[PDB]
């Protein structure tokens, strides 16, 4: 159930896993925050995440559970 609870834990999970890397955290917020501004397109949001969590499946997967069939996530080898 993608609700405020699912989004809350996700953030807390991304903060702990990247406790030694604040850059990654700040990057995720930028993508979402940038989207709210209505400037960055969808493909841009999934792209950043797909690159931000290149070595984190549980991350790219957790977010994938939110995106609809329309805008899915890709894993560039």
């Amino acid at each position: 159930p993608v609700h405020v609870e699912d989004a809350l834990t996700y953030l807390d999970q991304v903060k702990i896993r990247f406790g030694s890397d604040p850059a990654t955290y700040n990057g995720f917020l930028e993508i979402m925050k940038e989207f709210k501004s209505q400037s960055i397109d969808t493909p841009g949001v999934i792209r950043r995440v797909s690159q931000l969590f290149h070595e984190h499946p549980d991350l790219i997967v957790g977010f994938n559970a939110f995106l609809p069939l329309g805008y899915r996530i890709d894993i560039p080898k």
Binding site: A7, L11, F28, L29, M32, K36, L67, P68
Partner: peptide
């Protein structure tokens, strides 16, 4: 994407 708007909202103000 309503899930994208809720995601940024909780990140910008989730408390």
């Amino acid at each position: 994407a309503p899930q994208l708007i809720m995601l940024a909202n909780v990140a910008l103000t989730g408390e």
